[PDB]
């Protein structure tokens with residue numbers, strides 16, 4: 230309940246993700262590693278790509294073992310290619326342990342590493358089913374639990390805000406009660422591949438979208454620290470934006486803004502947060518016919534873009550976007566909440582984050598219980 234050593238072990242920059250310090254090999258080589266609940270490989274830069282502050286030098290490690298197998302990982306945007314091996318891995322500001330983990334030594338990549346970012350690898354925290362090349366490549370967290378007495382859970386407090394610094398905590402093997410207020414509320418992990426969950430109802434400023442709830446999870450809903458946006462299925466996005474436009478009628482904005490094709494800027498600290506509605510996702514609860522509600526503010530979904538050279542004003546991107554891969558509860562969701570990935574009990578806990586950004590009128594919220602019928606029908610098959 231109190232893991233003081235792990236508090237504040239996350240760093241980052243706006244729009245560049247949250248990383249944790251790790252060591253690989255003997256003697257230990259220090260690397261900054263993106264915390265990613267939306268993938269399942271531990272994959273680290275292993276060659277001098279010019280964007281990289283540093284990289285894993287396998288020749289320097291006496292504990293390195295080669296698996297004599299490569300892996301090619303294409304994405305929608307980018308790609309990486311790597312060579313598989315195992316080595317000793319530890320987390321300096323995490324549990325006092327050392328595990329032998331699979332490592333994909335990245336040897337070629339495209340549109341993967343971020344120019345100007347301070348991380349050199351990715352820690353895939355999701356399950357073996359989506360590991361590359363196949364489910365026999367045991368993910369890091371699985372090895373950690375198998376090889377040690379670290380309990381089968383972790384929790385994330387992602388704290389949003391020159392690119393401004395972000396931070397937070399990754400509590401490995403436990404929960405730190407100072408990181409949230411009120412109660413944790415749990416939603417079932419529907420299936421252990423991604424951190425899959427079921428959205429049961431959507432509200433904009435308390436106004437139900439009245440869609441068939443299956444649309445909310447077409448073809449899945451996931452919790453993903455490695456995605457910035459709240460990503461919504463195309464039809465859900467359309468209805469949500471229509472409703473958000475209606476709720477913020479006080480001012481007009483161009484169509485491009487809602488599509489993330491264009492920024493909107495306001496003069497120095499004069500953001501009309503109050504014209505923008507709250508957004509509420511109801512998640513499947515732990516018991517039959519019971520749900521709970523998570524609520525985020527414009528402070529979560531209207532994200533500052535700091536690196537605009539051509540403007541002297543305060544510029545923002547609408548960080549709700551359309552998706553072909555289902556709902557993605559990215560940083561836009563997770564920055565509102567302390568999120569507990571309770572792998573042992575196949576569930577995910579949400580609580581109001583003690584570090585979430587809000588104003589004097591409105592706060593992010595986690596509330597329940599509510600009575601919701603036919604919640605199983607909301608899952609897609």
Ligand SMILES: CC(F)(F)[C@H]1OC(N)=N[C@](C)(c2cc(NC(=O)c3cnc(OCF)cn3)ccc2F)[C@H]1F
Nearest residue numbers: 243244245246265267268304453454455456457560
């Ligand atoms: C499916 C997908 F969208 F391509 C990616 O999504 C996830 N979850 N992880 C990967 C391995 C990834 C993730 C990132 N993530 C980020 O750069 C990032 C940036 N800002 C974030 O939050 C706001 F700070 C979160 N993640 C970068 C490169 C990447 F390759 C990809 F699989």
